[PDB]
PDB file of C-alpha atoms in Angstrom:
ATOM      1  CA  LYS A   1     131.343 116.386  83.387  1.00  0.00           C
ATOM      2  CA  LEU A   2     132.395 116.043  87.202  1.00  0.00           C
ATOM      3  CA  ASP A   3     129.843 118.709  88.686  1.00  0.00           C
ATOM      4  CA  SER A   4     126.780 116.774  85.841  1.00  0.00           C
ATOM      5  CA  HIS A   5     128.089 113.203  86.905  1.00  0.00           C
ATOM      6  CA  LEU A   6     128.381 114.279  91.111  1.00  0.00           C
ATOM      7  CA  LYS A   7     124.857 115.969  90.702  1.00  0.00           C
ATOM      8  CA  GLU A   8     123.017 112.975  89.456  1.00  0.00           C
ATOM      9  CA  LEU A   9     124.362 110.401  91.321  1.00  0.00           C
ATOM     10  CA  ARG A  10     123.613 112.373  94.526  1.00  0.00           C
ATOM     11  CA  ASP A  11     120.139 113.566  93.357  1.00  0.00           C
ATOM     12  CA  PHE A  12     119.408 108.978  93.026  1.00  0.00           C
ATOM     13  CA  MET A  13     121.371 109.112  96.737  1.00  0.00           C
ATOM     14  CA  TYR A  14     119.420 111.534  98.317  1.00  0.00           C
ATOM     15  CA  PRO A  15     115.833 111.360  96.969  1.00  0.00           C
ATOM     16  CA  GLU A  16     114.545 113.436  99.888  1.00  0.00           C
ATOM     17  CA  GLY A  17     117.768 115.654  99.831  1.00  0.00           C
ATOM     18  CA  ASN A  18     119.340 114.278 103.245  1.00  0.00           C
ATOM     19  CA  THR A  19     119.295 111.065 103.609  1.00  0.00           C
ATOM     20  CA  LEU A  20     121.462 108.160 102.113  1.00  0.00           C
ATOM     21  CA  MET A  21     118.573 106.143 100.871  1.00  0.00           C
ATOM     22  CA  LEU A  22     119.528 102.447 101.203  1.00  0.00           C
ATOM     23  CA  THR A  23     116.167 100.834 100.962  1.00  0.00           C
ATOM     24  CA  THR A  24     113.243 101.517  98.333  1.00  0.00           C
ATOM     25  CA  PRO A  25     111.232 103.337 100.505  1.00  0.00           C
ATOM     26  CA  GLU A  26     108.247 101.072  98.832  1.00  0.00           C
ATOM     27  CA  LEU A  27     109.798  98.492 100.141  1.00  0.00           C
ATOM     28  CA  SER A  28     110.302  99.508 103.582  1.00  0.00           C
ATOM     29  CA  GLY A  29     106.703  99.903 103.783  1.00  0.00           C
ATOM     30  CA  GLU A  30     105.816  96.403 103.184  1.00  0.00           C
ATOM     31  CA  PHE A  31     108.029  95.540 105.537  1.00  0.00           C
ATOM     32  CA  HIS A  32     106.804  96.753 108.356  1.00  0.00           C
ATOM     33  CA  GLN A  33     103.732  96.041 107.826  1.00  0.00           C
ATOM     34  CA  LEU A  34     104.150  92.685 107.143  1.00  0.00           C
ATOM     35  CA  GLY A  35     105.696  92.707 110.352  1.00  0.00           C
ATOM     36  CA  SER A  36     102.097  94.647 111.786  1.00  0.00           C
ATOM     37  CA  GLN A  37     100.774  91.455 110.746  1.00  0.00           C
ATOM     38  CA  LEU A  38     102.076  89.030 111.245  1.00  0.00           C
ATOM     39  CA  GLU A  39     102.270  89.733 115.127  1.00  0.00           C
ATOM     40  CA  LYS A  40      99.060  89.440 114.759  1.00  0.00           C
ATOM     41  CA  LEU A  41      98.741  86.276 113.740  1.00  0.00           C
ATOM     42  CA  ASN A  42     101.089  85.666 116.504  1.00  0.00           C
ATOM     43  CA  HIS A  43      98.658  86.426 119.185  1.00  0.00           C
ATOM     44  CA  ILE A  44      95.682  84.647 118.102  1.00  0.00           C
ATOM     45  CA  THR A  45      97.578  82.022 117.434  1.00  0.00           C
ATOM     46  CA  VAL A  46      98.680  81.912 121.582  1.00  0.00           C
ATOM     47  CA  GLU A  47      95.946  82.509 122.647  1.00  0.00           C
ATOM     48  CA  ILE A  48      93.634  79.700 120.482  1.00  0.00           C
ATOM     49  CA  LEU A  49      96.752  77.262 122.244  1.00  0.00           C
ATOM     50  CA  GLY A  50      95.402  78.776 125.435  1.00  0.00           C
TER      51      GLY A  50
ATOM     52  CA  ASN B   1     114.691  89.592 105.446  1.00  0.00           C
ATOM     53  CA  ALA B   2     111.715  88.749 103.385  1.00  0.00           C
ATOM     54  CA  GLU B   3     112.118  84.911 103.644  1.00  0.00           C
ATOM     55  CA  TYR B   4     112.056  85.464 106.996  1.00  0.00           C
ATOM     56  CA  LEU B   5     109.151  86.692 107.020  1.00  0.00           C
ATOM     57  CA  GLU B   6     107.718  84.120 104.764  1.00  0.00           C
ATOM     58  CA  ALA B   7     108.643  80.838 106.673  1.00  0.00           C
ATOM     59  CA  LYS B   8     107.505  82.538 110.136  1.00  0.00           C
ATOM     60  CA  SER B   9     103.926  82.542 108.226  1.00  0.00           C
ATOM     61  CA  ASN B  10     104.027  79.744 107.390  1.00  0.00           C
ATOM     62  CA  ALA B  11     105.155  78.037 109.639  1.00  0.00           C
ATOM     63  CA  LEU B  12     102.730  80.135 112.705  1.00  0.00           C
ATOM     64  CA  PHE B  13      99.443  78.800 109.869  1.00  0.00           C
ATOM     65  CA  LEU B  14     100.551  75.572 110.013  1.00  0.00           C
ATOM     66  CA  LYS B  15     101.080  75.549 113.705  1.00  0.00           C
ATOM     67  CA  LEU B  16      96.971  76.707 113.931  1.00  0.00           C
ATOM     68  CA  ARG B  17      95.697  73.442 111.346  1.00  0.00           C
ATOM     69  CA  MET B  18      97.368  70.659 112.641  1.00  0.00           C
ATOM     70  CA  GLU B  19      95.725  71.917 116.501  1.00  0.00           C
ATOM     71  CA  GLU B  20      92.249  71.773 114.677  1.00  0.00           C
ATOM     72  CA  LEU B  21      92.915  68.981 112.502  1.00  0.00           C
ATOM     73  CA  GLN B  22      94.062  67.368 116.468  1.00  0.00           C
ATOM     74  CA  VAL B  23      91.208  68.497 117.519  1.00  0.00           C
ATOM     75  CA  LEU B  24      88.626  67.246 115.061  1.00  0.00           C
ATOM     76  CA  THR B  25      90.236  63.148 115.669  1.00  0.00           C
ATOM     77  CA  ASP B  26      89.413  64.750 119.592  1.00  0.00           C
ATOM     78  CA  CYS B  27      86.244  65.072 118.483  1.00  0.00           C
ATOM     79  CA  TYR B  28      84.626  62.030 116.121  1.00  0.00           C
ATOM     80  CA  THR B  29      85.498  59.066 117.422  1.00  0.00           C
ATOM     81  CA  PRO B  30      83.896  55.716 115.525  1.00  0.00           C
ATOM     82  CA  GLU B  31      81.645  54.868 118.391  1.00  0.00           C
ATOM     83  CA  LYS B  32      80.462  59.367 117.964  1.00  0.00           C
ATOM     84  CA  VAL B  33      79.865  59.109 113.744  1.00  0.00           C
ATOM     85  CA  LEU B  34      77.763  55.572 114.273  1.00  0.00           C
ATOM     86  CA  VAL B  35      76.027  57.851 116.603  1.00  0.00           C
ATOM     87  CA  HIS B  36      75.492  60.770 115.237  1.00  0.00           C
ATOM     88  CA  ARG B  37      74.526  58.780 111.558  1.00  0.00           C
ATOM     89  CA  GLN B  38      71.426  57.772 113.084  1.00  0.00           C
ATOM     90  CA  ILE B  39      70.742  60.696 114.509  1.00  0.00           C
ATOM     91  CA  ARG B  40      71.293  62.440 110.738  1.00  0.00           C
ATOM     92  CA  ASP B  41      68.939  59.736 109.418  1.00  0.00           C
ATOM     93  CA  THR B  42      65.643  59.564 111.733  1.00  0.00           C
ATOM     94  CA  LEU B  43      66.249  63.537 111.111  1.00  0.00           C
ATOM     95  CA  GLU B  44      66.284  63.390 107.552  1.00  0.00           C
ATOM     96  CA  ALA B  45      63.458  60.154 107.385  1.00  0.00           C
ATOM     97  CA  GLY B  46      62.015  63.554 109.243  1.00  0.00           C
ATOM     98  CA  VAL B  47      62.752  66.143 107.650  1.00  0.00           C
ATOM     99  CA  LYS B  48      61.037  63.734 104.145  1.00  0.00           C
ATOM    100  CA  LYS B  49      57.785  63.097 105.578  1.00  0.00           C
ATOM    101  CA  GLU B  50      57.358  66.623 106.896  1.00  0.00           C
TER     102      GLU B  50
ATOM    103  CA  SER C   1     146.493 114.511  82.838  1.00  0.00           C
ATOM    104  CA  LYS C   2     146.472 113.967  86.663  1.00  0.00           C
ATOM    105  CA  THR C   3     143.329 114.612  86.857  1.00  0.00           C
ATOM    106  CA  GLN C   4     142.600 112.124  83.735  1.00  0.00           C
ATOM    107  CA  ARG C   5     144.746 109.252  85.349  1.00  0.00           C
ATOM    108  CA  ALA C   6     142.116 109.734  88.924  1.00  0.00           C
ATOM    109  CA  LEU C   7     139.242 109.341  86.615  1.00  0.00           C
ATOM    110  CA  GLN C   8     140.625 106.371  85.021  1.00  0.00           C
ATOM    111  CA  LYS C   9     141.629 104.735  88.509  1.00  0.00           C
ATOM    112  CA  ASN C  10     137.836 105.086  90.288  1.00  0.00           C
ATOM    113  CA  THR C  11     135.973 104.337  86.949  1.00  0.00           C
ATOM    114  CA  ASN C  12     135.060 100.767  87.336  1.00  0.00           C
ATOM    115  CA  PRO C  13     131.414 100.996  87.423  1.00  0.00           C
ATOM    116  CA  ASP C  14     131.239 103.876  84.835  1.00  0.00           C
ATOM    117  CA  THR C  15     128.639 106.131  86.476  1.00  0.00           C
ATOM    118  CA  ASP C  16     126.225 105.611  83.340  1.00  0.00           C
ATOM    119  CA  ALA C  17     126.027 102.292  83.966  1.00  0.00           C
ATOM    120  CA  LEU C  18     125.630 102.998  88.382  1.00  0.00           C
ATOM    121  CA  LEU C  19     123.006 105.271  87.382  1.00  0.00           C
ATOM    122  CA  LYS C  20     121.653 102.103  84.758  1.00  0.00           C
ATOM    123  CA  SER C  21     122.394  99.940  87.916  1.00  0.00           C
ATOM    124  CA  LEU C  22     120.885 101.587  89.980  1.00  0.00           C
ATOM    125  CA  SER C  23     117.550 102.363  87.731  1.00  0.00           C
ATOM    126  CA  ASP C  24     117.726  98.360  86.779  1.00  0.00           C
ATOM    127  CA  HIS C  25     117.966  97.589  90.479  1.00  0.00           C
ATOM    128  CA  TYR C  26     114.554  99.950  91.780  1.00  0.00           C
ATOM    129  CA  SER C  27     112.565  97.971  89.364  1.00  0.00           C
ATOM    130  CA  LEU C  28     113.071  94.267  90.356  1.00  0.00           C
ATOM    131  CA  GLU C  29     112.172  95.798  93.309  1.00  0.00           C
ATOM    132  CA  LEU C  30     108.898  97.424  92.901  1.00  0.00           C
ATOM    133  CA  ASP C  31     107.733  94.718  90.045  1.00  0.00           C
ATOM    134  CA  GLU C  32     109.088  91.209  92.277  1.00  0.00           C
ATOM    135  CA  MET C  33     109.258  91.913  95.320  1.00  0.00           C
ATOM    136  CA  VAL C  34     107.172  94.846  96.427  1.00  0.00           C
ATOM    137  CA  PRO C  35     104.247  92.410  94.845  1.00  0.00           C
ATOM    138  CA  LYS C  36     105.574  89.482  96.829  1.00  0.00           C
ATOM    139  CA  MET C  37     105.409  91.503 100.413  1.00  0.00           C
ATOM    140  CA  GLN C  38     101.662  92.166  99.522  1.00  0.00           C
ATOM    141  CA  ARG C  39     101.037  88.262  98.354  1.00  0.00           C
ATOM    142  CA  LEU C  40     102.031  87.668 101.996  1.00  0.00           C
ATOM    143  CA  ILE C  41     100.374  90.264 103.474  1.00  0.00           C
ATOM    144  CA  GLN C  42      96.533  89.363 102.139  1.00  0.00           C
ATOM    145  CA  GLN C  43      97.298  85.143 102.900  1.00  0.00           C
ATOM    146  CA  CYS C  44      98.210  87.152 106.832  1.00  0.00           C
ATOM    147  CA  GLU C  45      94.916  88.248 107.083  1.00  0.00           C
ATOM    148  CA  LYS C  46      93.064  85.038 105.156  1.00  0.00           C
ATOM    149  CA  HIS C  47      94.957  83.567 108.004  1.00  0.00           C
ATOM    150  CA  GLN C  48      93.547  85.335 110.719  1.00  0.00           C
ATOM    151  CA  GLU C  49      89.989  85.093 109.097  1.00  0.00           C
ATOM    152  CA  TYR C  50      90.453  81.482 109.484  1.00  0.00           C
ATOM    153  CA  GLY C  51      91.732  81.662 113.552  1.00  0.00           C
TER     154      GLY C  51
END
């Protein structure tokens, strides 16, 4: 039982086997993409104000 | 992080919309709106006759 | 008996309850947070066109 619980909890916390998964990978991608799009919008806003 | 990116997106957009409306007020003074109306009415009379 | 006492001290939360809480949290991020971020991405793209 201890071996099973350890294995199930480890497989959920380490889905790629080697890295502790703290954030949902889908959500981490969306944060990076929104960050990039907002940096472009800021550039357009600075250019027009200039 | 999600709330911060949302607030920054909205603030950038409202700044852009504010500067557009300020250019439109600087463009269309009451004296110019009167002249634009005379030009419109002369053009519409031309379009109708032709 | 030492091992069962150690299991009883560590058991708040239970492993099945923790796995369920982890699965429910993962589903909540996919159903609510991901489609909120995608809407904000599409709004940013429309605001770039409005530029």
